[PDB]
């Protein structure tokens, strides 16, 4: 007696429907890009909009126990990376003057490890913000053809892949 799907249409017993387990609405398989045989291979179904919302909220949901452990393993893999040599530790002040003269929010993997250890981060977005802060500081301070900058590029690319499927 009701209207279903993104296409707002009443039930048609001759059409293949699948139910979203998040929103409990029903969708034509043809409208959300899943056929019956593909549907047979999955336990829960999640509709495209609901799925978008889940993808978007991964960076915003509270960090759990396992998430924190995961962040520790991520930093470890980053610390072991060959192009991670410039980011392992804070810049030695009595070594690079103008570094702290122009960078007022430095970040480094050791400091990030400390922040993870004491649960300074509560959302994945905060952790990602600090990692990005490392690479952007670097790219702001160094020329784009320099090894420092390019190292920032390489490790950021590695990082983005390592983060996939995290939550």
């Amino acid at each position: 007696t009701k209207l279903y799907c993104i296409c707002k249409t009443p039930y048609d017993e001759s059409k293949f429907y699948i139910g979203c387990d998040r929103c409990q609405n029903w969708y034509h398989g043809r409208c959300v890009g899943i056929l019956q045989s593909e549907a047979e291979l999955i336990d829960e179904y999640v509709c495209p909009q609901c799925q978008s919302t889940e993808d978007a909220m991964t960076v915003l949901t509270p960090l759990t126990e396992k998430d924190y452990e995961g962040l520790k393993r991520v930093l470890r893999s980053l610390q072991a990376h060959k192009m991670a040599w410039p980011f392992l530790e804070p810049v030695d002040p009595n070594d690079a003057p103008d570094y702290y003269g122009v960078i007022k929010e430095p970040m480094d993997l050791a400091t990030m490890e400390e922040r993870v250890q004491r649960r300074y981060y509560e959302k994945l977005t905060e952790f990602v913000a600090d990692m990005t802060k490392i690479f952007d500081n670097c790219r702001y301070y160094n020329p784009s053809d320099s090894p420092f900058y390019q190292c920032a590029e390489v490790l950021e690319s590695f990082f983005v892949q390592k983060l996939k499927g995290f939550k």
Binding site: Y11, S14, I18, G19
Partner: peptide
């Protein structure tokens, strides 16, 4: 999954 077929 939860479906309705013909």
């Amino acid at each position: 999954a939860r479906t309705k077929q013909t």
